[PDB]
Amino acid sequence: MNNTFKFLHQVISKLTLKAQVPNYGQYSHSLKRPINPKVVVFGNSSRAYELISSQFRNFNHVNGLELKGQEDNIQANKVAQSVLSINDGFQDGYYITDFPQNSKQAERLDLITDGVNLALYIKDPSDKVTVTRQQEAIDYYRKTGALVEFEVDPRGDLEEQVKQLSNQVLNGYKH
């Protein structure tokens, strides 16, 4: 706020922040991942599926396309129940596909689940159904600031794209 007091304020804030989250400076990298990562993935290309499978080996798939037709409240509630639990395998990460299809479903899911930790959009030029189906959801996640865009070239290097995607999602995760 003030140039002269910025240094003193920053020092005091860093010391006090340790009380809320002890040893935050030593475990900062670990804290980037949330306790129950909930991911919403946009993209239906073959390359996108490969990246999803590689990046989400330890996550559980949630197919939201089966819920089409039901009302938004029921669809949101069913998704929330799916992604608000941990299996006996101790896999607390869930990534959803083909959902939400509209802002109403997106907002409803966020309220029930306190928001989605990540909303990953893989823009593949060889995909022409993701934009036509889930444009409203993408705009909502862009508004709320939870949207991460990772353009993929089909003729790119699979290893490099995976590494870049892993870094971006790790940075894009939210608690």
Partner: protein, 329 residues
């Protein structure tokens, strides 16, 4: 001279007292004679040279043939209580780590993990020294009261007296164990921890693990006497306490069970995985071996002979190596 030295003199004086022989310095501060030979500096130094061993014998004799003193006992065990107080906590955390949540909080199920968990809170009340005062109070309790009522007594009587006092002061031990394993600051203090236990569970909740603490205490006392005596069978007794060590581990888990600090209850504690019964056995033995309790009041006749014999051997150094053997003295 008026604003720094007056406040700095005590620090220097305290520094010198630790690093200098107080008795020898006191002798040299008095100069002259009143009519008796041997008050000169040369004679005083010769006396002060042997006074180191004489004072050790007198201090040892006092701890055996005179009523025990709390300050003297604490001084003998100063390291175990003053500097390495946090070692007791990490040992307690390691013992109870089987049914704790530490493994999910950036820690491993090993002595290194227990050390890190304790040290993650710093060194002060929430860190290394958390529960240090309770450890001091507990030492001032049954371990000291037992010495008062069992001075110069046999092993059996010492075990009986110690068992009675440990039962009497046991609730303090349970509170200390809960504080040690309270890694999230759930309890604000000893009274707060005791109040929560009594409010939620009955008063009997504070006496969990008493009968397995008493048996382990009896084994420890037997081992302590053996090492004090210095007999060859001390190693056999060391194995005995190691075999009895899981009794202590069960005691810690029972104390730490039935509370938010633990993932298990009293019923589940008994049927815990048997591969972790000897949790921290080697750290416990090492710590006890290096810092075994120096209860001179309970030393038997053989131990007293050993200490006096050691002092006497050192006292023999004050003869001239090249003294001539003369026909007439």
């Amino acid at each position: 001279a008026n604003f720094v030295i007056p406040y700095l003199k005590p620090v220097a004086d305290f520094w010198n007292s630790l690093c200098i022989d107080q008795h020898q310095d006191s002798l040299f501060q008095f100069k002259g004679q009143t009519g008796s030979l041997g008050t000169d500096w040369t004679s005083k130094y010769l006396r002060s040279e042997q006074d180191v061993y004489n004072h050790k014998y007198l201090q040892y004799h006092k701890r055996v043939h005179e009523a025990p003193e709390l300050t003297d006992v604490i001084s003998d065990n100063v390291y175990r209580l003053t500097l390495f107080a946090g070692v007791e906590r990490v040992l307690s955390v390691r013992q109870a780590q089987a049914i704790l949540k530490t493994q999910f909080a950036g820690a491993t199920e090993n002595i290194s993990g227990a050390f890190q968990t304790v040290l993650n809170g710093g060194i002060f009340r929430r860190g290394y020294f958390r529960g240090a005062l309770l450890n001091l109070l507990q030492f001032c309790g049954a371990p000291y009261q037992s010495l008062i009522w069992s001075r110069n007594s046999g092993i059996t009587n010492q075990v009986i007296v110690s068992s009675i006092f440990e039962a009497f002061f046991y609730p303090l031990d349970t509170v200390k164990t809960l504080i040690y394993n309270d890694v999230q600051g759930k309890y604000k203090g000893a009274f707060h921890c005791a109040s929560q236990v009594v409010q939620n569970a009955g008063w009997s909740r504070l006496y969990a693990g008493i009968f397995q603490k008493l048996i382990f205490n009896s084994a420890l006392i037997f081992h302590l006497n053996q090492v004090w005596d210095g007999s060859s069978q001390q190693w056999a007794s060391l194995a005995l306490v190691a075999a009895a060590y899981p009794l202590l581990v069960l005691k810690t888990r029972f104390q730490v069970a039935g509370t938010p600090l633990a993932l298990a209850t009293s019923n589940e504690v008994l049927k815990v995985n048997r591969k972790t019964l000897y949790a921290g056995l080697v750290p416990y033995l090492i710590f006890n071996t290096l810092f075994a309790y120096e209860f001179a009041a309970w030393h038997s006749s053989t131990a007293q002979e050993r200490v006096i014999g050691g002092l006497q051997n050192a006292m023999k150094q004050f003869s001239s190596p090249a003294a001539e053997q003369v026909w007439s003295s």
